[PDB]
Amino acid sequence: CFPITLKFVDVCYRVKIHEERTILSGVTGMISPGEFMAVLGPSGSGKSTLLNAVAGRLHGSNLTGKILINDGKITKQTLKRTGFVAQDDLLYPHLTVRETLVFVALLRLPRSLTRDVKLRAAESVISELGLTKCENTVVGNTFIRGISGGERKRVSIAHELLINPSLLVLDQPTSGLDATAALRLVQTLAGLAHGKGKTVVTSIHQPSSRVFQMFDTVLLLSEGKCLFVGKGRDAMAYFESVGFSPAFPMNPADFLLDLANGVPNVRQTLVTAYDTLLAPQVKTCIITTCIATWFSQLCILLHRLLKERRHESFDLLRIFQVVAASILCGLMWWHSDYRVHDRLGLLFFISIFWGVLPSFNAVFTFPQERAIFTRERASGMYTLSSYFMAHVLGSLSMELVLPASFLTFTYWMVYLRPGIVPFLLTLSVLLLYVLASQGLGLALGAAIMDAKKASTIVTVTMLAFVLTGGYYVNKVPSGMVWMKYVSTTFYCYRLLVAIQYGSGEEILRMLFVEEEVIGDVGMWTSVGVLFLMFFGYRVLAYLALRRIKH
Amino acid sequence: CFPITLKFVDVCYRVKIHEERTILSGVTGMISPGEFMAVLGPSGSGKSTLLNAVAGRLHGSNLTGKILINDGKITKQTLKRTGFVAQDDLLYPHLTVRETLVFVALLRLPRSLTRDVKLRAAESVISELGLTKCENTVVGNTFIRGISGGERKRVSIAHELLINPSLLVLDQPTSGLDATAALRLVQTLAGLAHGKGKTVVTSIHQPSSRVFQMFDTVLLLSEGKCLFVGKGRDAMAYFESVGFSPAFPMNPADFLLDLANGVPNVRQTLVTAYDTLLAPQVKTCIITTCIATWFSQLCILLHRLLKERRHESFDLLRIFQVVAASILCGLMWWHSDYRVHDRLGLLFFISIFWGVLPSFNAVFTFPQERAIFTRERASGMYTLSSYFMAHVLGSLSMELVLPASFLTFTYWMVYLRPGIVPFLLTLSVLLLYVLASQGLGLALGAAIMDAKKASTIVTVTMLAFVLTGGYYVNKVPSGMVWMKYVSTTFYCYRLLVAIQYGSGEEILRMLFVEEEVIGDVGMWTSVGVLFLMFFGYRVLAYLALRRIKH
Numbered sequence A, B: 001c002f003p004i005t006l007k008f009v010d011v012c013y014r015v016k017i018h019e020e021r022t023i024l025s026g027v028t029g030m031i032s033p034g035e036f037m038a039v040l041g042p043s044g045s046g047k048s049t050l051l052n053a054v055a056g057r058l059h060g061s062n063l064t065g066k067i068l069i070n071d072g073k074i075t076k077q078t079l080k081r082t083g084f085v086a087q088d089d090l091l092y093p094h095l096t097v098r099e100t101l102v103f104v105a106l107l108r109l110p111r112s113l114t115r116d117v118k119l120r121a122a123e124s125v126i127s128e129l130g131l132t133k134c135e136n137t138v139v140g141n142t143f144i145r146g147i148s149g150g151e152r153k154r155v156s157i158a159h160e161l162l163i164n165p166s167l168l169v170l171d172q173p174t175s176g177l178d179a180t181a182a183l184r185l186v187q188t189l190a191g192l193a194h195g196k197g198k199t200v201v202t203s204i205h206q207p208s209s210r211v212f213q214m215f216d217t218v219l220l221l222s223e224g225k226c227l228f229v230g231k232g233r234d235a236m237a238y239f240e241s242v243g244f245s246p247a248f249p250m251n252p253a254d255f256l257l258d259l260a261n262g263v264p265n266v267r268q269t270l271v272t273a274y275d276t277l278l279a280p281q282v283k284t285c286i287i288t289t290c291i292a293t294w295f296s297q298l299c300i301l302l303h304r305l306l307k308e309r310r311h312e313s314f315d316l317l318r319i320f321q322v323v324a325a326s327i328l329c330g331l332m333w334w335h336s337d338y339r340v341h342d343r344l345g346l347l348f349f350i351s352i353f354w355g356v357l358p359s360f361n362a363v364f365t366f367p368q369e370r371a372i373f374t375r376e377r378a379s380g381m382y383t384l385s386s387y388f389m390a391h392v393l394g395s396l397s398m399e400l401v402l403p404a405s406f407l408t409f410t411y412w413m414v415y416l417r418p419g420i421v422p423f424l425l426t427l428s429v430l431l432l433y434v435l436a437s438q439g440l441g442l443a444l445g446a447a448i449m450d451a452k453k454a455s456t457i458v459t460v461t462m463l464a465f466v467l468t469g470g471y472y473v474n475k476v477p478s479g480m481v482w483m484k485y486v487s488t489t490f491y492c493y494r495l496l497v498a499i500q501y502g503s504g505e506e507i508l509r510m511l512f513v514e515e516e517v518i519g520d521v522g523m524w525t526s527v528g529v530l531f532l533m534f535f536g537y538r539v540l541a542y543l544a545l546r547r548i549k550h
């Protein structure tokens, strides 16, 4: 019941010439709750920069104004009561529209309500916006042909009607629908402000006259400076104080947008007849359930993420290629015996393979979710902890079956140390190393939010780890022995060599000894550092995601 | 001067319920040259599927109709005379709008004209659409804040006015501009059909009445079936034959879209009053400069691609990380001598590094250009040969300076074979191997147009090449010796070992001999296969790009 009163005074936004050009220059206005606003202007004006300014999405040293919610600046608490509908529609392309609106319903409604109230509120906004025939079809990308471009927008307004916010900042909501859905959409957005008493800000672009009668305070913009702030029928008459009237009966909207360019420099005489005639008048007018919440927000964000990857049939081919690589690694060391250089080669090639394959595929988790994650993080839907521990729990379904299907062939074809306990110890060490190296691909990929930029960082880093993982050079300079402890391949190599060759007495009985496990690190201080790396790379991937608010 | 007469008869398009739903059902119409059409309807109708059908962009077993240009089906020759302006605007985000319109001007105009005619035609469409104040600013992505959303559309119509096509199929051109740029844009598209005599098809959505007076044949659609085909003022009067008229004076457009839904099942009585009253009336109405062209199309597509990567300052950091990895590889083998296992380790780690780093970064060239390349390839702007030999010549500027900056440190810090001829032979073999392995990342990445799907194919393939590149296993089964010839790491390893250790007599004098160059392959039949691979992987990357027409 937060009564948002939005007041902006003298906001200016200048970008560098890439001098500087003024996008906005001196915009003032007051939006008390109940007032249905409208931001009009030509297609270069500064409307969407003003709407990205008052919705908090624009911050920086460029803005030289004061945006005030309830006579205070924009906090983080008011940024979860403000609903923002952007121009471009960024949605999850593999869901349908019913799963999208159901997940936004279940994740954002007050949680004191039962589940069927949370579903009837989701299918009470589908019938209100008219998305009933496209209810059970996909909302896909440019390539994945899904729903229309006018239903990819009526979904992205019901995406923010299931928040019930107190300040509704819509950025061109109806540019994309016909003239009989525009009227019903503005009837909805006016029944949310002459009904439930909210604060609605619209940037409508090409209205009719009976879509213009619904507005209570129109902001007419022109090249950054505003021409009019005030009522609907006071416009089309305020411009008779300066002497501009149509010669024949037309709509008010195309006339107010004809005067917005100058259709003897009409624009500047309206700007100076604004600034001193009717601008000083607006200058005188101005715990135990906190856990259950977090676990429901994990079940939802995991059930969505497991619906995203049911479309992907490029996982049987991943399994069949890793099986082929395992058959290769088994058939080449087929003629190996237990007695050791030829086997340390295999136990280092496994450490190369499963530090290179998970870390080079984990750089596509967070960069490929960026355009939707920034939007949902700015909106304030879920917590970042519950979002991060859904990708973490979503990778751990097929990043545990590929090394198991690898090792199930390449153990019993090479005929390594027989018995079920060294096999299970080898499999557990391989799975722990895979999860430890996947954290590196998570962290480089959350820190540099670009798959192409991070794929040449993680490649050089994993090759430096493969280099200083104890196999290649014999006599390393002793001021540089310390680097193999920072490696992640070193611990897995030491553990695999330890598991296969004991602490080493039976080999010293049968038969160098230098890089075989009679050596440097123990067996528990090499699983105590793999677990530390598995936790620390994910803590760093969370801390590098905490910076992305925008 | 191709006089396109577009005629579609009984086109139906059904998608599977993911039974089947009819998107379109029985659409007929004739567009002779000079007729300015308009496709109207509600926001679920089947307009953009009809416009993707008649512009050739929809093909498949779903379409059960006949699209006819000049009483013949759509060839590839007519697909370079048809201009299609899609709903979503896919543009190159790093250019400005002036470079974008200049490159489309220089690349598509008849080439018999001089260059300044080709530039005055480019800045004669900027002033016509009004893009003069946003002429020299960027057109960037969702992240890169560039021009507006109404200037990201007035650019994507001047993108297809600099073709001068004979059939102009616009898909919602004005949904995004105000009511005084809509009138001027439809004045332009009507002066292209009452002027230069073309065939213009528009899907306008929210028109005025004086944007509706410009239309010569309106197609009113409703839920896939069409309600009206014919003149402008014959609509608003044909619906008086069935008995629907407004009670008070309004625009024709909102009335024709109010009847399009049923505002006693009005929609079906209009469909059956269409099908037998005024549908049978339309059933009765129905060399040495060829090289210079290709080289100009290479200079343009290369000067654009070198403008795309001037924004990237993440290349000094690539150079500084590869320099750090080289300093690492030098400092670890700092204590190496010329006399050989410790050096074959280094000559195989270089072969690992420069087969892993180029092939894992070359998978982002063609998947990251996909959404714009499919559009330009469907449009018919450049040839695929000249497009492919611009990415090929664009990678070869920093995929030749990273191995040189690597080797310049890691040769003289390890102190390998001294002299300028083994150094230059090593550098040339390294550059040839880098270009040979970059072709693998090109081919897997053109074949599977997804960076995430191809990054787990190229990783397993390069690890299989590293495995069967002659270093790891000692006694491979002899039915599997043949696999190292398919490898690309094997030839570079053999060449580096040959260059450093001769054919081998001085080492047999100073001092195994088995995997040192006294061995299997020669020195010329290992550069004759690296060149074959360098050509064959790029031929496969061209053949896998030839399938993407869409």
Ligand SMILES: Nc1ncnc2c1ncn2[C@@H]1O[C@H](COP(=O)(O)OP(=O)(O)OP(=O)(O)O)[C@@H](O)[C@H]1O
Residues within 6 Å of the ligand: A015, A018, A023, A042, A043, A044, A045, A046, A047, A048, A049, A050, A205, B134, B137, B138, B145, B146, B147, B148, B149, B150, B151, B176, B177
């Ligand atoms: N980062 C930037 N750098 C340079 N110029 C910019 C930048 N962002 C916006 N502009 C310019 O400032 C003007 C205002 O942009 P804005 O997004 O407000 O337009 P708009 O009113 O949203 O357009 P429309 O109403 O057609 O969507 C635009 O014409 C644009 O060219």
Ligand SMILES: Nc1ncnc2c1ncn2[C@@H]1O[C@H](COP(=O)(O)OP(=O)(O)OP(=O)(O)O)[C@@H](O)[C@H]1O
Residues within 6 Å of the ligand: A134, A137, A138, A145, A146, A147, A148, A149, A150, A151, A176, A177, B015, B018, B023, B042, B043, B044, B045, B046, B047, B048, B049, B050, B205
């Ligand atoms: N691949 C598909 N699978 C299932 N349904 C589809 C598919 N493509 C389109 N549709 C449905 O068919 C209808 C027609 O889509 P179309 O793109 O023609 O709408 P439109 O007329 O372009 O909408 P608008 O005019 O608002 O842009 C849409 O409502 C959409 O839901």
